[PDB]
DNA sequence: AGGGCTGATCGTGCAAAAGTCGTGCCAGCCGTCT
DNA sequence: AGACGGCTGGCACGACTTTTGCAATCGCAGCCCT
């Protein structure tokens, strides 16, 4: 929660208003952006399990 | 990063895709024309530089 | 004097003609064409950004839609309503356009209307107005009913928009049977209904202008300077120029020479376009300095043949390449043809024009009773008083050109 | 699209357990490659419109700010798979606009500043048979011997540009010698590391 | 052995058919006071 | 409670513009066709 990417800000606000108080691990959204990198995905041996 | 509004001043966000398309299309055209090895090689050097 | 022998050239057609035809085009038309041409010649030469948020413009409406509980289809329809909103704040594309583009039977008119009504007034009130009018009704209903004269305002806004369009207060009072001048409070409240609540943000309409020159009017004698940065520069690849003579192969040298000749012709064409434009622009700025200074009201009758005779401008190359030239000056941004004003009659060796007439008619209609605008006959009288002598036929015709209601149609209750 | 799951499918995430980082082959590289843009222009103040096949261009790098297109056709979030003819770009969420790199080909190689520059100069291992000669090969200026047993030249033998010309003149059309990569890296490309491992 | 025949080069207008404005002109119409 | 009246725009004609659609025969001399 505590920074900048307002993308899950909407989800956080909706969950809190619902009192859901829930979050999704997802990816460093910025490391998902670093995959966007990945030498342009050049390095994607990423064996997500 | 437009500080003043009139000019954006992309703080280190230049795109070389200009050079990409330029060199690739030029190589495609001159390849059918049996381009000089010198011009082909200079394009090669700058192409992957 | 008489006839005997003596006397004695010619131009070129096709290739030179094509190069010349390229210049009559627009500025960016020439720029994109130059890019496409240079695509061939081998012998020529902090992730993102954002604006106001929460206050996030149309995207703020999209987020407030994303800020409420809705299903996938409701969110998709709200997004179709929001993304299909123009710079005026209303829903740019109606529900029917979205249904046709989707082609989805699951998304229906009822479902789309429900999703849009859930998104009718969230941030701010009256977004995706879909022809604001029911948006005005939504603003009135969302506004507290405790406001006085709200019933009269609602009755007027329901189906009396046409009567208010003509500013016919008498017709409105006769139709709605409203108490005279008691509906005035309701009408004034309707005037302050915050139209373009969407445009309040959506009117972030950006300003676009690429004048082909700048007239600095440097100490008078309006100094026209060509937009050299906007003037492209054609560079020849000198490395190819040094890599062809050494070519022991004749075919490569011949192809290089032909490419060089074509590129030189193109560069000369662009340069000639620029130079002729500069000369004619100086001539016009001399002619339209009164139009440049006092304005379109003092816009003199300017013609190409007269300008060509006055500045010794091209007799036909000018007539060709004159298309699409724009200038930024103290008056504003003006087109090339905008500089030349038509011819109108003036006695006593004086002369008259068209843009002058348009601005004068605008002033004269402004110089009319707010209840009763200036008649086309009255406009003719004003023009004759100015010495224009426009007469009623051209007066009505230009008022139609000026697109303003004249007396018997601009008539409003005082 | 029934639109009853398109937004539902929009929100998804993976476990990303035991992630690996390694090289690849160009197939996936062009698999990422989607668009084609031509110009280096940044932004046009003439019309305040995106560059056409330029930087931040349409038909490239993902969707548009709204589901509306730069040209103006198929301007709706409801239009999902329909592609307007005026400019071909996916009309969807702007999130994919961050999730779209491109690939640049230009059809020819040059120096990798990966080897011999870091604290470990992988140069020798990175260039393999070239052994720190890939940088020299990055000039297409030697056309070294590729193969040829008839000529008195090894397949993995250095033949500089003058050496290549002399080989072609003397050995005739028997001393095969190619550039790009020029000094040694092409013969590296035509090499097997199993014998090198056994020899080491 | 005699004829054909070939184009390598040969580049700032115009003209022509078309269109389009200026101004007029005209026909119905509505506010109203008769 | 129908005509006045100016609107007001449809309709008109010429009058100024205008855009496109337009490249050669050189020049020999060798080569091809006869």
UniProtKB/Swiss-Prot annotation, chain A:
Q: How is it modified after translation?
A: Acetylated on several lysine residues in the presence of glucose.
Q: Where are the transmembrane segments?
A: none
Documented applications:
Co-administration of salinamide and rifampicin or salinamide and myxopyronin suppresses the emergence of resistance to both antibiotics.
Quote the subunit structure annotation. The RNAP catalytic core consists of 2 alpha, 1 beta, 1 beta' and 1 omega subunit. When a sigma factor is associated with the core the holoenzyme is formed, which can initiate transcription. The rRNA transcription and antitermination complex (rrnTAC) consists of RNAP, NusA, NusB, NusE (rpsJ), NusG, SubB, ribosomal protein S4, DNA and precursor rRNA; S4 is more flexible than other subunits. In pull-down experiments interacts with CedA.
What is the protein's known function? DNA-dependent RNA polymerase (RNAP) catalyzes the transcription of DNA into RNA using the four ribonucleoside triphosphates as substrates.
Family of the protein in this entry: Belongs to the RNA polymerase beta chain family.
Q: What is this protein called?
A: DNA-directed RNA polymerase subunit beta
Q: Which gene encodes it?
A: rpoB
UniProtKB/Swiss-Prot annotation, chain B:
The record describes its post-translational modification as: Acetylated on several lysine residues in the presence of glucose.
Query: What practical purpose does this protein serve?
Result: Co-administration of salinamide and rifampicin or salinamide and myxopyronin suppresses the emergence of resistance to both antibiotics.
Subunit and partners = The RNAP catalytic core consists of 2 alpha, 1 beta, 1 beta' and 1 omega subunit. When a sigma factor is associated with the core the holoenzyme is formed, which can initiate transcription. The rRNA transcription and antitermination complex (rrnTAC) consists of RNAP, NusA, NusB, NusE (rpsJ), NusG, SubB, ribosomal protein S4, DNA and precursor rRNA; S4 is more flexible than other subunits.
Name the family. Answer: Belongs to the RNA polymerase beta' chain family.
Function of the molecule: DNA-dependent RNA polymerase (RNAP) catalyzes the transcription of DNA into RNA using the four ribonucleoside triphosphates as substrates. Resistance to the antibiotics salinamide A, salinamide B, rifampicin, streptolydigin, CBR703, myxopyronin, and lipiarmycin can result from mutations in this protein.
Name of the protein in its database record = DNA-directed RNA polymerase subunit beta'
In its UniProt entry, the species of origin is given as Escherichia coli (strain K12)
The protein's gene is named rpoC
Q: Which residues of the full protein are shown?
A: 253 to 301 of 1407
